[PDB]
Amino acid sequence: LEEKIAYYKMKGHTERGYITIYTNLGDFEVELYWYHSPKTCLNFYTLCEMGFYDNTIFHRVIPNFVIQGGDPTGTGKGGKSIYGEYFEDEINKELKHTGAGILSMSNNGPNTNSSQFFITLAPLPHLDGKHTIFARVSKNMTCIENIASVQTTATNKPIFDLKILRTST
Ligand SMILES: [Cl-]
Ligand SMILES: [Cl-]
Ligand SMILES: [Cl-]
Ligand SMILES: [Cl-]
Ligand SMILES: [Cl-]
Numbered sequence: 001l002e003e004k005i006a007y008y009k010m011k012g013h014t015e016r017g018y019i020t021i022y023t024n025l026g027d028f029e030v031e032l033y034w035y036h037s038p039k040t041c042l043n044f045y046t047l048c049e050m051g052f053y054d055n056t057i058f059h060r061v062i063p064n065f066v067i068q069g070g071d072p073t074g075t076g077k078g079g080k081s082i083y084g085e086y087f088e089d090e091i092n093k094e095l096k097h098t099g100a101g102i103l104s105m106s107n108n109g110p111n112t113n114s115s116q117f118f119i120t121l122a123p124l125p126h127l128d129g130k131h132t133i134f135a136r137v138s139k140n141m142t143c144i145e146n147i148a149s150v151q152t153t154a155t156n157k158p159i160f161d162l163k164i165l166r167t168s169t
Pocket of ligand 3: 098099100121122123
């Protein structure tokens with residue numbers, strides 16, 4: 001299974017390159033950066049496939065910053081990885097938070113990745129080097145914009161639930 005990591009590092013782009021995410025606000029497609037972030041992609045892809053993100057919410061939405069998700073509890077405190085509890089960052093000089101639509105791991109400081117991630121809504125150079133960029137929205141950014149338009153509470157939670165219904169490969 002670190003063999004599985006080393007394999008999809010190479011073959012990921014052509015054998016399992018895209019995931020479609022269906023939300024109650026529409027569907028979008030992400031492109032996984034297997035070569036640069038192979039451990040992070042294997043986790044995300046595996047979690048998607050086994051239905052781990054099914055019926056989970058975007059528990060924060062902050063316009064001009066990020067949509068944040070991937071917590072089965074919906075609180076912002078939970079999440080797990082296919083590797084057990086937490087796993088290392090994969091920081092790559094070649095990947096930076098340069099525009100909207102980038103998927104990056106949310107975390108609690110260095111090497112505390114589990115299943116929470118952001119989708120960026122603007123350039124965020126201040127995150128470069130602290131969060132693992134591993135994919136980007138490759139189809140239908142409108143859906144991301146619709147999600148960012150929904151009203152939120154003072155702690156940035158959407159006033160009604162915004163959720164991943166399921167994932168497709
Ligand atoms: Cl790749
Ligand atoms: Cl926004
Ligand atoms: Cl942008
Ligand atoms: Cl956070
Ligand atoms: Cl906070």
